[PDB]
């Protein structure tokens, strides 16, 4: 049930922890595959939304 603002906030914590370069390499891969999952999860919302308002707003 990942609403949009939950994903964005979750994503920002993930990116900031990467750029410090403090992780062992093994979990830099673990939390990079979660990074791109949320990128597409968030994008599917806007595609869902934009296609929606168009049918709602258009005749």
């Amino acid at each position: 049930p990942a609403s949009f603002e939950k994903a964005l906030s979750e994503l920002e914590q993930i990116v900031t922890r990467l750029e410090s370069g403090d992780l062992p390499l093994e979990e830099a891969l673990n939390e990079f595959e979660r990074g791109v999952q949320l990128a597409r999860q968030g994008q599917a919302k806007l595609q869902q939304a934009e296609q929606r308002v168009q049918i709602l707003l258009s005749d």
């Binding site: 964005l8 994503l11 990116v15 750029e19 390499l25 990128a39 968030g42 994008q43 806007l46």
Partner: peptide
Amino acid sequence: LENQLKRTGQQQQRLTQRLNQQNP
């Protein structure tokens, strides 16, 4: 709303670019 959706358009694409700049 048309301005609302864009505000999320930039924020999403801003974090995504920072993510793809951090390849392992």
